[PDB]
Amino acid sequence: PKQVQEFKQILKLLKSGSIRAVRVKTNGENTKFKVRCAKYLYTYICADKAKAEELKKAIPKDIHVVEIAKKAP
Amino acid sequence: RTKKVGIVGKYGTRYGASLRKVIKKIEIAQHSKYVCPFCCKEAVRRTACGIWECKGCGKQIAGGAYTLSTISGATVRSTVRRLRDAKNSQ
Amino acid sequence: GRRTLSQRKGRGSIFKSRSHHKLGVAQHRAIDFFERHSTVRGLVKSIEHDPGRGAPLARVVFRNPRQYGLDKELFICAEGLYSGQYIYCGSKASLHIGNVLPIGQCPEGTVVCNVESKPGDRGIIARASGNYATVISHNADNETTRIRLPSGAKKTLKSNCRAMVGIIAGGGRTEKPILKAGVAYRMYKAKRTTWPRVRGVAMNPVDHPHGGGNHQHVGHPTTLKRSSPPGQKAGKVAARRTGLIR
Amino acid sequence: KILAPGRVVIILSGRFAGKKAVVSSVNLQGTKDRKYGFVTVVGVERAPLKITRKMSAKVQEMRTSVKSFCKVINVNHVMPTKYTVNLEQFNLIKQVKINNFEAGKVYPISQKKAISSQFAEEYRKGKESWLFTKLRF
Amino acid sequence: AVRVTYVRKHSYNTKSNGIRIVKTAGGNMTVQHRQKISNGVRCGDCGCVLAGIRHIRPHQYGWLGKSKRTVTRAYGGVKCHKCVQKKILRAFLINEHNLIKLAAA
RNA sequence: AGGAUUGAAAGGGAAUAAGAUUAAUAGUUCUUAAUCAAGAGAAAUGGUAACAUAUCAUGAACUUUAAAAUGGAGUGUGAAAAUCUACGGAAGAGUUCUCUUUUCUUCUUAACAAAAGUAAAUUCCACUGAAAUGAAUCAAUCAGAGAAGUGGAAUUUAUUGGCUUUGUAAGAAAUUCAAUGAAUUGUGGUAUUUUUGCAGUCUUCAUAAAAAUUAAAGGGAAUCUUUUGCUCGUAC
RNA sequence: UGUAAGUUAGCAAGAAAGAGUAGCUCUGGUGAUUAUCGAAUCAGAACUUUAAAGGUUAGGGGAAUCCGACUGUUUAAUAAAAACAUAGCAUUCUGAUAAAUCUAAAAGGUUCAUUACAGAAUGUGAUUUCUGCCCAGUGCUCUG
RNA sequence: UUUCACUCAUUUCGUUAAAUGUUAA
Known part of the structure; x- marks a missing residue:
């Protein structure tokens, strides 16, 4: 697994056509946007709610989105 | 520390006074440092029987088994130098 | 009777040489035109310890007088050689320690080592630690020179036999007294199986000709003819003399 | 003065070890930022290759071409x-x-x-040779 | 303390059978296989360990980047900088001496 | 171009881990997350230097160097784990007519990668030139073929880069609670042992393997996605 | 605390011999960091008792004589030793196409990847002191 | 028959069978 640092790369990754799945996890302090690509599982630790919403709109509707919470699926 | 048995006190009391005497002279000269013929430093120590290495100088020298230069091996170098000079001159 | 220990030595089963960590064959390089009529220069890359022998070995590196590459040789160190030294092999080589010259060019009285008994056979005589041979005289009529072997014997060789000027390194090795049985055990690490030697008188009559009776003794003279068969040739052989020398 | 403009040196250390350079400016004291005695040199990074009479004239141009470098070098790292x-x-x-x-x-x-x-045109005329011939270590 | 077992079928403390015991979720301790300690490179002349190159297994050098298996210098990776400096001076000083000694003395 | 066959389930060797699962198999199955090999879609900069740059930035024949690949002893020390312990707690359990702010249990984290913060040791580079000689270790040992000082570079420290930290990753697992759903999961130690490295010292008439295989150099000849990974052992 | 004769001057030597040691309450020494923190270790003092290493673990000591110098090995299943080995000392042969020696033979094989400071064959058994006389007999040898 | 001189069988060797011998330069 790899970790992306700032906001610019994740959108470029999201807009890239190499995506396969997206899973969003909400923790007691932050929100993680794990993007499942072909090779790696990129993740992004987000602590700003407004910036998280911007990310959620950036997700193409065709891809499958999994929401994870205190109870695992 | 010791009256007269300096380096051969590690042999204790079990090899004969005469044999411990002979081995003392050889072991002292085998473990001492010698003047290095290329850098004039007391920095040559034996690595194996016949191989001597200059520590702070980076050279390997072939020598005697326990001493850097043997008496027989020193006169020979003198002899060859005289022979070479005579041959080169007429 | 049985077959004695000297008979079992000639089959070479456990008496084979323990030569696994040895460096290799130590000898001059093969003779060629450039050694017959010129000089080839070698570089003493390093001096190494060859197991089983008391003299150090030099890893000389000549270049390639006829092709491209390196000719990694393996000489026997002469006393005084050092790493990074240049040595010249050939008929025109200067009379310096470590140089290889035909035995005819050496002035009478020169001390050489690693001499070839026959031209081009890459070294026979004067190869142990501290040993050397002296040139006695030349004979230009039949191209022969006389040398004095380390045993004292005089030998006549061809004047073009090669030899290395100097003294084999590591002299004075045997003057240090072994003190312990264990130390002698380690001496034959890279040699044959010979060390713990049981006296013939301590054996039984089947084992050895000396294997005695109610008192440990030989019984018959220990000086024997050279023609004795293997099996009874035990002791002094063709002894011209006995007893302490005066 | 050993190190004067126009003097040919050979670089002893660094990426350009063994290259032949030409001294342009010398400063044995060193500037504020340069705490060492240095010299600014221009050298031949890639020496020109030898050519024969069979290659086409366009090949002889690129084969005789010279790639040069300019570098500030300590005076203790040039000979x-x-x-x-x-x-x-x-x-x-x-x-x-x-x-x-x-x-x-x-x-x-x-x-x-x-x-x-x-550099290349001068060598094509052959006026300077030792500067453009390569050093074989 | 939690006692562990060899995971592979080797059962002897050989050089290639080295292991490390590390902790794991639930308090259990698992067994890893650790790599052998390797030597680096040496100068072809002075036999000194070269700087700038890692001490890894021979095959792992191919995995490294092209620039991470050498040093950007003449004879880089086979000779030390001191080894190289002596080479340059020898090549230049001897050649210059040959021009004065012989070759129109 | 150079020498044929065989010879190691303890020598060399491309690449995988955590959790779960079975009446029994599991670095082999399942979930998740990785790695490796073979394939498919006139030719670079920076640094004074040691040297450094997400593939970059061409590099044939031929030749050399290095790795694979090297004894043992003893001393010092870096790091991890276990045990012990300091402070702060959360949950459960035991004793309790004699006391005990009490005694005990749980408080965890992989392969592979990242680079906030920050180490020990060794070797080199630049400035300068040491005597009133200095620098240093438990011991040593070192210096005008250049010490000490200041500023740098590199390598090693059980994967990337050693340790804390981060992604994996809490969604797992452990300890409790309720009847599947809920809670918590700090920071340290000039302590002992073990493991693993490192540094120098001692010792040998002992010097303590080879090849497959890989990389680099000298030389200048030529002009990210995807497929596949066969045979045999595997119970006890 | 104390320790002899002897000695290869290294040892003997843990020689021999004597005293102390428990529990509890205290006191002091040995550092780090710059007042706070930390380590088991040593020494000392009052008091008490059933007077203290001893549950377990845990050398009997001395005076001599013989043999072997020592560490080591040995008759698996009645002999572990004074026997074998050992270092040291001494003798003999051999210049390598040799000496020893395996094989029926052999561009065959072992010491030998070696070269007299080496290879092969023997006796004695560390050190110190010393090895006397005999070449007739039997061997061995002669450059005769 | 002995003593010579030679090599041509024969022995013992060395190498990548890598300038041997005689003229020439």
Whole structure:
């Protein structure tokens, strides 16, 4: 697994056509946007709610989105 | 520390006074440092029987088994130098 | 009777040489035109310890007088050689320690080592630690020179036999007294199986000709003819003399 | 003065070890930022290759081409030679000063190829040989 | 303390059978296989360990980047900088001496 | 171009881990997350230097160097784990007519990668030139073929880069609670042992393997996605 | 605390011999960091008792004589030793196409990847002191 | 028959069978 640092790369990754799945996890302090690509599982630790919403709109509707919470699926 | 048995006190009391005497002279000269013929430093120590290495100088020298230069091996170098000079001159 | 220990030595089963960590064959390089009529220069890359022998070995590196590459040789160190030294092999080589010259060019009285008994056979005589041979005289009529072997014997060789000027390194090795049985055990690490030697008188009559009776003794003279068969040739052989020398 | 403009040196250390350079400006004291005695040199990074009479004339041009370099070097990392070039002939070298060199940024490529062409044309005329012949270690 | 077992079928403390015991979720301790300690490179002349190159297994050098298996210098990766400096001076000084000694003395 | 066959389930060797699962198999199955090999879609900069740059930035024949690949002893020390312990707690359990702010249990984290913060040791580079000689270790040992000082570079420290930290990753697992759903999961130690490295010292008439295989150099000849990974052992 | 004769001057030597040691309450020494923190270790003092290493673990000592110098090995299943080995000392042969020696033979094989400071064959058994006389007999040898 | 001189069988060797011998330069 790899970790992306700032906001610019994740959108470029999201807009890239190499995506396969997206899973969003909400923790007691932050929100993680794990993007499942072909090779790696990129993740992004987000602590700003407004910036998280911007990310959620950036997700193409065709891809499958999994929401994870205190109870695992 | 010791009256007269300096380096051969590690042999204790079990090899004969005469044999411990002979081995003392050889072991002292085998473990001492010698003047290095290329850098004039007391920095040559034996690595194996016949191989001597200059520590702070980076050279390997072939020598005697326990001493850097043997008496027989020193006169020979003198002899060859005289022979070479005579041959080169007429 | 049985077959004695000297008979079992000639089959070479456990008496084979323990030569696994040895460096290799130590000898001059093969003779060629450039050694017959010129000089080839070698570089003493390093001096190494060859197991089983008391003299150090030099890893000389000549270049390639006829092709491209390196000719990694393996000489026997002469006393005084050092790493990074240049040595010249050939008929025109200067009379310096470590140089290889035909035995005819050496002035009478020169001390050489690693001499070839026959031209081009890459070294026979004067190869142990501290040993050397002296040139006695030349004979230009039949191209022969006389040398004095380390045993004292005089030998006549061809004047073009090669030899290395100097003294084999590591002299004075045997003057240090072994003190312990264990130390002698380690001496034959890279040699044959010979060390713990049981006296013939301590054996039984089947084992050895000396294997005695109610008192440990030989019984018959220990000086024997050279023609004795293997099996009874035990002791002094063709002894011209006995007893302490005066 | 051993180290004077126009003197040919051989670089002893660094990426350009073994290359032949030409001294342009000398400073044995060193500037504020340069705490060492240095010299600004222009050298032949890639020596020209030998050519024969069978290659086409366009090949002989690229084969005889010279790739040069300009570098500030400590005077303790150069070994001056006995050969001296004329900076009047190599007028492009004379413009290489300490203020032309900035720390951490790429030397101008256009200037480097400018001197490189000047080096090549001089060698094509054969006037200077020891500078352009390669050193075999 | 939690006692562990060899995971592979080797059962002897050989050089290639080295292991490390590390902790794991639930308090259990698992067994890893650790790599052998390797030597680096040496100068072809002075036999000194070269700087700038890692001490890894021979095959792992191919995995490294092209610039991470050498040093950007003449004879880089086979000779030390001191080894190289002596080479240059020998090549230049001897050649210059040959021009004065012989070749129109 | 150079020498044929065989010879190691303890020598060399491309690449995988955590959790779960079975009446029994599991670095082999399942979930998740990785790695490796073979394939498919006139030719670079920076640094004074040691040297450094997400593939970059061409590099044939031929030749050399290095790795694979090297004894043992003893001393010092870096790091991890276990045990012990300091402070702060959360949950459960035991004793309790004699006391005990009490005694005990749980408080965890992989392969592979990242680079906030920050180490020990060794070797080199630049400035300068040491005598009133200095620098240093438990011991040593070192210096005008250049010490000490200041500023740098590199390598090693059980994967990337050693340790804390981060992604994996809490969604797992452990300890409790309720009847599947809920809670918590700090920071340290000039302590002992073990493991693993490192540094120098001692010792040998002992010097303590080879090849497959890989990389680099000298030389200048030529002009990210995807497929596949066969045979045999595997119970006890 | 104390320790002899003897000695290869290294040892003997843990020689021999004597005293102390428990529990509890205290006191002091040995550092780090710059007042706070930390380590088991040593020494000392009052008091008490059933007077203290001893549950377990845990050398009997001395005076001599013989043999072997020592560490080591040995008759698996009645002999572990004074026997074998050992270092040291001494003798004999051999210049390598040799000496020893395996094989029926052999561009065959072992010491030998070696070269007299080496290879092969023997006796004695560390050190110190010393090895006397005999070449007739039997061997061995002669450059005769 | 002995003593010579030679090599041509024969022995013992060395190498990548890598300038041997005689003229020439």
